[PDB]
Design a protein around this ligand. Structure first.
Ligand code: SAH
Length: 272
């Protein structure tokens, strides 16, 4: 099965956002910084009341809930997670708004409905390079003439290794990376910036904006680690020491990587 949600609730903030947060103010709590990230991403889609927003890889729904409440738009979210689909539908059934709200347990490969805007945060890393062209073709064909998509994903730093770029690449990296791709992003892939640009532009997309959040991810990871650690006993009771150590190793290790510049997190604004 998939890792139990009661496990995730041991380190994620209340909204259950599972992606790099945005510390607009350094004093923000994790929940405040995750709400800040949602507003940052959505603010770029120039949302207007009555529009329809597609959330590709919606997780537990915080982004779509925010879109409805703060921006007053209709939403639709796709996820591959059984637990999330059910959780988001229950969420949807509990709230009251004349806004349409739909959640679907299916990949972006099967979605083919016209929407006004698209947002995808932390999903792209799970797609795998071989499907990139398809993803951009599908998202580009569902968007309108004035459509835009906000693609938020982990990326590999560009060639700056010269006169900079901790040119170290061996063990205390290579091995960990295999660990990350095997345990954290099974069948996934971390793209280079040139690659994102490559496939996006090849379907007609114009990359009109890019924003890096490198150091915000390091602090997000630190906070998830601190929370998991404080809830160690409960984490081990619900799952196991193996899973616990697995995640602590992931969180603490990646925090170091983004902090040292080995990896980055970018938000790409793409216009049809
Ligand atoms: N091919 C695919 N199609 C649709 N959703 C996918 C997908 N591959 C991964 N996902 C989804 O993308 C999400 C990654 S975790 C991020 C969740 C949410 N965007 C947040 O910011 O918290 C999960 O919901 C996962 O099920």
């Amino acid at each position: 099965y998939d890792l139990s949600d009661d496990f995730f609730r041991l380190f994620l903030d209340p909204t259950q956002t599972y992606s790099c947060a945005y510390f607009e103010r350094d004093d923000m709590t994790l929940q405040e910084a995750q709400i800040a990230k949602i507003d940052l991403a959505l603010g770029k889609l120039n949302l207007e009341p009555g529009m329809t927003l597609l959330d590709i890889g919606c997780g537990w729904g915080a982004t779509m809930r925010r879109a409805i409440e703060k921006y007053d738009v209709n939403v639709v979210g796709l996820t591959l997670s059984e637990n999330q689909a059910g959780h988001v539908q229950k969420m949807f059934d509990q709230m009251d708004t004349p806004r349409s709200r739909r959640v679907l347990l299916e990949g972006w490969e099967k979605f083919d409905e016209p929407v006004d805007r698209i947002v995808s945060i932390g999903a792209f890393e799970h797609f795998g390079h071989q499907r990139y062209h398809h993803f951009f073709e599908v998202t580009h064909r569902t968007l309108p003439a004035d459509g835009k998509m906000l693609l938020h994903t982990i990326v590999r730093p560009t060639f700056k290794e010269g006169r900079e770029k901790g040119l170290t690449l061996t063990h205390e990296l290579v091995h960990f990376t295999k660990f990350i791709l095997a345990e954290i992003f099974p069948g996934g892939w971390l793209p280079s910036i040139p690659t994102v640009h490559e496939y996006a532009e090849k379907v007609g997309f114009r990359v009109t904006a890019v924003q890096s959040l490198q150091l915000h991810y390091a602090r997000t990871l630190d906070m998830w680690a601190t929370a998991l650690e404080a809830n160690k006993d409960q984490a081990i009771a619900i799952q196991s020491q193996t899973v616990y150590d697995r995640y602590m190793k992931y969180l603490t290790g990646c925090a170091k990587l983004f902090r040292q510049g080995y990896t980055d997190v970018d938000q790409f604004t793409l216009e049809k």
